Amino acid sequence: IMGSSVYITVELAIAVLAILGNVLVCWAVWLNSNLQNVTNYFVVSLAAADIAVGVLAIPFAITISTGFCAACHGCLFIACFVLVLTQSSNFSLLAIAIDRYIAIRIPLRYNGLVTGTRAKGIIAICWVLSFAIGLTPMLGWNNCGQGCGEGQVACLFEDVVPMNYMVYFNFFACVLVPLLLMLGVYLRIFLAARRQLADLEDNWETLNDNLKVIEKADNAAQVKDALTKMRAAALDAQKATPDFRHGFDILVGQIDDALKLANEGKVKEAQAAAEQLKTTRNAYIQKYLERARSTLQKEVHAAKSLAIIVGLFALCWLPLHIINCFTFFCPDCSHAPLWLMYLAIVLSHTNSVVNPFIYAYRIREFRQTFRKIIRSHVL
Amino acid sequence: IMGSSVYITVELAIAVLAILGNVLVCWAVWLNSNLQNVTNYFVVSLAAADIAVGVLAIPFAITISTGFCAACHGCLFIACFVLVLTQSSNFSLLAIAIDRYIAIRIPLRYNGLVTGTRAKGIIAICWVLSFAIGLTPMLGWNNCGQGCGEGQVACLFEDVVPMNYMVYFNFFACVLVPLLLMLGVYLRIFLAARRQLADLEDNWETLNDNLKVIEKADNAAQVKDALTKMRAAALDAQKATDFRHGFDILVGQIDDALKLANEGKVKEAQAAAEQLKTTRNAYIQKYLERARSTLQKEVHAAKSLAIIVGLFALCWLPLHIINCFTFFCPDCSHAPLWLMYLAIVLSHTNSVVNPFIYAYRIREFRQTFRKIIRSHV
Numbered sequence A: 001i002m003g004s005s006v007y008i009t010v011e012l013a014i015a016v017l018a019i020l021g022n023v024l025v026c027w028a029v030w031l032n033s034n035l036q037n038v039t040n041y042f043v044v045s046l047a048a049a050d051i052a053v054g055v056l057a058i059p060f061a062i063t064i065s066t067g068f069c070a071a072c073h074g075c076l077f078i079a080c081f082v083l084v085l086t087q088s089s090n091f092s093l094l095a096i097a098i099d100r101y102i103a104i105r106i107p108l109r110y111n112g113l114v115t116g117t118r119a120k121g122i123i124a125i126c127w128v129l130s131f132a133i134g135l136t137p138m139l140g141w142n143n144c145g146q147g148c149g150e151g152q153v154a155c156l157f158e159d160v161v162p163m164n165y166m167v168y169f170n171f172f173a174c175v176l177v178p179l180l181l182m183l184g185v186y187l188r189i190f191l192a193a194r195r196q197l198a199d200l201e202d203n204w205e206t207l208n209d210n211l212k213v214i215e216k217a218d219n220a221a222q223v224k225d226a227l228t229k230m231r232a233a234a235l236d237a238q239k240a241t242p243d244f245r246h247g248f249d250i251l252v253g254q255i256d257d258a259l260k261l262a263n264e265g266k267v268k269e270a271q272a273a274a275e276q277l278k279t280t281r282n283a284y285i286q287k288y289l290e291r292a293r294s295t296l297q298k299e300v301h302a303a304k305s306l307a308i309i310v311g312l313f314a315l316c317w318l319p320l321h322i323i324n325c326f327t328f329f330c331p332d333c334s335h336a337p338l339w340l341m342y343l344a345i346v347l348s349h350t351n352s353v354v355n356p357f358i359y360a361y362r363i364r365e366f367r368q369t370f371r372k373i374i375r376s377h378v379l
Numbered sequence B: 001i002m003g004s005s006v007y008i009t010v011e012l013a014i015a016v017l018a019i020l021g022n023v024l025v026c027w028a029v030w031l032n033s034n035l036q037n038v039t040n041y042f043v044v045s046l047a048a049a050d051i052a053v054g055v056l057a058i059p060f061a062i063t064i065s066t067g068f069c070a071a072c073h074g075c076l077f078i079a080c081f082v083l084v085l086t087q088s089s090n091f092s093l094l095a096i097a098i099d100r101y102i103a104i105r106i107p108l109r110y111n112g113l114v115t116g117t118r119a120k121g122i123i124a125i126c127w128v129l130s131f132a133i134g135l136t137p138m139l140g141w142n143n144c145g146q147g148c149g150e151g152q153v154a155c156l157f158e159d160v161v162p163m164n165y166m167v168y169f170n171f172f173a174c175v176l177v178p179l180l181l182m183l184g185v186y187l188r189i190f191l192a193a194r195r196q197l198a199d200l201e202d203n204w205e206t207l208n209d210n211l212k213v214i215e216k217a218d219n220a221a222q223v224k225d226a227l228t229k230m231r232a233a234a235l236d237a238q239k240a241t242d243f244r245h246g247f248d249i250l251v252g253q254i255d256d257a258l259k260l261a262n263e264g265k266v267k268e269a270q271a272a273a274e275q276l277k278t279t280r281n282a283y284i285q286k287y288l289e290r291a292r293s294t295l296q297k298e299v300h301a302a303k304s305l306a307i308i309v310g311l312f313a314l315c316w317l318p319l320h321i322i323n324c325f326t327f328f329c330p331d332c333s334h335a336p337l338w339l340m341y342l343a344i345v346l347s348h349t350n351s352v353v354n355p356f357i358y359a360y361r362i363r364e365f366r367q368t369f370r371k372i373i374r375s376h377v
């Protein structure tokens, strides 16, 4: 088999999975109602760019690996467009990553900040900078101011796109920063799930232990110390908690009634009051947990969701762009074989097509809507 | 006197200093034919943007300080437009600095790359960049999501333009990046002189010595050893650089001096080598004339850049340095009213005196400014 026939056969397959995997998501949003929220409009817009990446961009990238006699400013257009469409995916994916940062770390402000209005404008900002970075060489910064005769060059990417443009401008800004942002967004969401866990479990253990002491502590002032450490832990739990505000005002009250029952000879009532506030028997503690729980198990999901996206985004775009930097800074030294460099192109067009499907299939509601269309409309 | 009455007074004074000095720069380039090159097209293009700053941006950046009752997207439009205008003064100053980087370190490809079509193009890139950045808040990244009633905010800058836009985005990319680039441009040009200076003052001295040897050089083959060093030095000088014609004859004359030196020393070596002394050496004399011309030409374009960078950092730093302090440390100590407003005036001063000082350092500009005065006056 040829070296070009294999590239095109594989490269055209990704274009199919591009359109297929992203219209199914574009199908599940148009059908299921509980998926039409703000977060998933970005998935609609990312899949919309991904379909433009599959329909229009991948054929324009195969066009570039041929190198036929064509005019400069025309062959420049082809390379600018595949740049434009590959800018849109990395930018729309960045919007989903930042949206998850808002609804998870700043939840009491998510409604009045990410409405349907600015979400329609955030995507409009992504596509505007895609056409700004994209159509930059067309306005001068290209490589034909001065084989096929006059006016016609070999239509390859490195021939019409300046390599310093790809090194200094395109990579450093449209792949590096978008990755270092989704990195910092994943990290601060990951770390947020780690701080909420350690303080809840430690507060918890102090409550059960102290109530365990008090119940089994007697003939000493240990009860006074145990109530003090219980009060402090309930307040630390109040600082993080926001139902939960009302219930915490009452837990503080029950510790005071506990301290008022610990005050005058009512040592058994102080033990009863520790039983009032002991986990098993407190309506407010149990309510406090399920909140502090539900957020943990939910945003650890959206943490691993980002861990998979960043782990896939860095994995796909860097090989193509790292090879670029060696060609510009180290052109005397060694290259990569003729097959390994085209794979760096294949991987680039993978992240731009299989990203909206991974985070979709990781959510249980998208996983149930997909099955309802495959069994019904497909068959 | 008022703290606001002096603000608009000082601001309007700067608005005129923009108008005159840069129309003067454009008055000069339109007169002299030899000023109509490609680099001074970037100086006119920059001088044109600084005229717009004093005509539109300064009247807009004052209305922004009043904090008057107006709809948000009306104060946004006044606030995004001042971000589009100051944008193009730093991106056109960047184009001058990039142009001066090419002409100095890569001169054998300057005219074949920086045509009037791509200079018409590069400037368009700088301007299309500004709209793509300045009109980001108008596309959503503003402040009126959720005094004067409903829908109308106190038309201040920080009331319509976010601060994560003016730190995470507008400073990181439109003050820090443009300034650090022109810093590296100055750095690579400043180091270009020391390397073109050394290897020549090396080649020249290696050449002076061996012939000064050859003059008082003894009988025997020691004269032949000295010629071998001169040939290698002449090859090094030919490597680092009409002109290429004079070296092949020079290399030809050293080989002409070589065979004669291989056989009879006393008489054969003296004629050719003595005419390789600067006096009877036409090709060395043409060669030294070029290096003397190029060396102190790029240093006056290196000091011209240390000034362009120094003036640029002296003004666009105090504004965005305070922007970062109010964004990453809003609780801690503030800069007072006048000092924060001074930083606004600073960032507006560079926008009216930056093409000037650079153009005024050009000697062809300096005569064209005095010819305008005597004719007008």
Ligand SMILES: CCNC(=O)[C@H]1O[C@@H](n2cnc3c(NCC(c4ccccc4)c4ccccc4)nc(C(=O)NCCNC(=O)NC4CCN(c5ccccn5)CC4)nc32)[C@H](O)[C@@H]1O
Pocket (backbone or CB within 6 Å): A061, A064, A065, A066, A082, A083, A086, A087, A090, A156, A157, A158, A166, A170, A174, A175, A320, A323, A324, A327, A335, A336, A338, A341, A342, A344, A345, A348, A349
């Ligand atoms: C969000 C941003 N979006 C993008 O960046 C998108 O733009 C595309 N792209 C981005 N850099 C691209 C890029 N660098 C060029 C790079 C390279 C070339 C080929 C394959 C991978 C990378 C290169 C390396 C070495 C020399 C020149 C360029 N070469 C291409 C693109 O088509 N090559 C297909 C057609 N070329 C070719 O047959 N060359 C042959 C290969 C062998 N000889 C080599 C190797 C070493 C030295 C000299 N000769 C040169 C001729 N495409 C790119 C890509 O599809 C991205 O998705």
Ligand SMILES: CCNC(=O)[C@H]1O[C@@H](n2cnc3c(NCC(c4ccccc4)c4ccccc4)nc(C(=O)NCCNC(=O)NC4CCN(c5ccccn5)CC4)nc32)[C@H](O)[C@@H]1O
Pocket (backbone or CB within 6 Å): B061, B064, B065, B066, B082, B083, B086, B087, B156, B157, B158, B166, B170, B174, B319, B322, B323, B326, B334, B337, B340, B341, B343, B344, B347, B348
């Ligand atoms: C391509 C780059 N282009 C540019 O950067 C241009 O855009 C303009 N600009 C860029 N950041 C700007 C910027 N930050 C706001 C910053 C500041 C404010 C005033 C003066 C200098 C800097 C600030 C600091 C602290 C608090 C809020 C904002 N404030 C203004 C601009 O007009 N203030 C005039 C109208 N506001 C005001 O009276 N507030 C008062 C100031 C005093 N109280 C303070 C200070 C501390 C704490 C509380 N209260 C707040 C209200 N203008 C800017 C400026 O004209 C630049 O030339």
